[PDB]
Amino acid sequence: RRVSARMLGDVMAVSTCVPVAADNVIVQNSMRISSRPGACYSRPLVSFRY
C-alpha cells in the first residue's frame, strides 16, 4: 500500500498515507518566487483540501 518511509538505520519505518481526490487538487499557473530572484523550485506548487 502507498506509504512513506525514512531510513531508521538498517531498518525502515512506515506511515500510511491518506488519499485525496483529483478534483480537490489544483496546480498554480506559475512557480516564480517573487521574494527571492534567482531561486526556483524544482517541482510545481499545489493547493488542496482533504
Partner: protein, 51 residues
C-alpha cells in the same frame, strides 16, 4: 583472536566492522536508529544504547 587486544572501531552495514570513525553527522532531536548486530539488532534512542 580470543586473547587478542581490544581494537577501536565502528560498526558498519551487514555486521561489518570499520576501523575508522568518520561517519559524523549533526545531532538531531528525537534520534532513533536500529543497527544490525550479529543475528539480531541493537536499538538506540537519542544516540543512547537501549537493548
Amino acid at each position: 583472536e580470543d586473547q587478542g587486544p581490544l581494537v577501536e572501531g565502528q560498526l558498519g552495514e551487514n555486521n561489518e566492522l570499520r576501523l575508522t570513525r568518520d561517519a559524523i553527522e549533526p545531532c538531531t532531536v528525537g534520534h532513533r536508529r536500529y543497527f544490525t548486530f550479529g543475528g539480531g539488532y541493537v536499538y538506540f534512542e537519542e544516540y543512547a544504547y537501549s537493548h
